[PDB]
């Protein structure tokens, strides 16, 4: 059942806690069921960090130790981690076969293009991709798809893009910041994973893969919707454009 999952989620995360922070355990559980249960149980609601964290407080009120607020504690957790935030994009090709990666000028590790005093997360990603690859991702950015993980303070929020041209002559705007840009066959990355150095991609090989499958079913079927759009018009009689 729906509540059988919510139960199991606390049995895996909330119960691995003893013996000795619980705000991360709460974030991790929310990520697990956000980047796995979403793609598998598509009907279920995509409940937020605070909400899912409150949802547990009502069902297992025995796990909560102090008398300090729910919302106040998530403020505190984000307050602690408020050092330098990082945002990026995972750019895939038209056929959903390869991902476009970048290798730094100081490190040989291959991460997604990543990196504002007032601008939002989307503007940061658009501007950092435009500075490290040349392609102004404005046209392709979907605000409702992303993966998130906090690495030793720095928060990493990667956006997911597909259908980008393999033929495209990418060149960096900031010359001495991005040493190399290359397309990587996705299947291969997964097999090579454990001589080549991969930074963030390794932490999200599973959600990236699941999302690729989701973006493929949606593409293959979208094609049979265009097919039937035409196949029905070229038989449904008086169909044109008079206005």
């Amino acid at each position: 059942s729906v509540d059988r999952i919510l139960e199991d989620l606390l049995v895996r995360f909330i119960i691995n806690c003893p013996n000795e922070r619980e705000l991360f355990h709460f974030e991790e559980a929310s990520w697990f069921y956000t980047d796995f249960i979403k793609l598998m149980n598509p009907t279920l609601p995509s409940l937020k960090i605070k909400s899912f964290a409150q949802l547990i407080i009502k069902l297992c009120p025995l796990v909560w130790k102090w008398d300090i607020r729910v919302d106040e504690a998530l403020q505190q957790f984000s307050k602690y981690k408020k050092s330098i935030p990082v945002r990026g994009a995972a750019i895939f090709n038209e056929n959903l076969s390869k991902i476009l990666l970048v290798q730094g000028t100081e490190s040989d590790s291959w991460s997604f293009p990543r990196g504002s005093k007032d601008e939002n997360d989307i503007d940061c990603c658009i501007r950092e991709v435009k500075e490290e690859i040349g392609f102004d991702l404005t046209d392709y950015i979907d605000d409702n798809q992303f993966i998130e993980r906090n690495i030793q303070g720095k928060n990493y929020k990667i956006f997911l893009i597909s259908g980008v041209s393999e033929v495209f002559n990418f060149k960096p705007q900031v010359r001495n910041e991005i040493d190399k840009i290359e397309w990587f066959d996705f299947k291969k990355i997964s097999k090579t994973m454990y001589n080549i150095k991969y930074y963030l991609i390794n932490s999200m090989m599973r959600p990236l893969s699941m999302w690729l499958r989701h973006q493929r079913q949606i593409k293959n079927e979208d094609q049979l919707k265009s097919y039937a759009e035409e196949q029905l018009k070229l038989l449904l009689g008086i169909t044109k454009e008079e206005q």
């Binding site: 059988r4 139960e7 199991d8 049995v11 119960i15 025995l62």
Partner: peptide, 18 residues
Amino acid sequence: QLEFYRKALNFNVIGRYD
């Protein structure tokens, strides 16, 4: 209490999954 009840609830997840 929690330690003991945990020995009864987690069983209904391992025995049902695989």
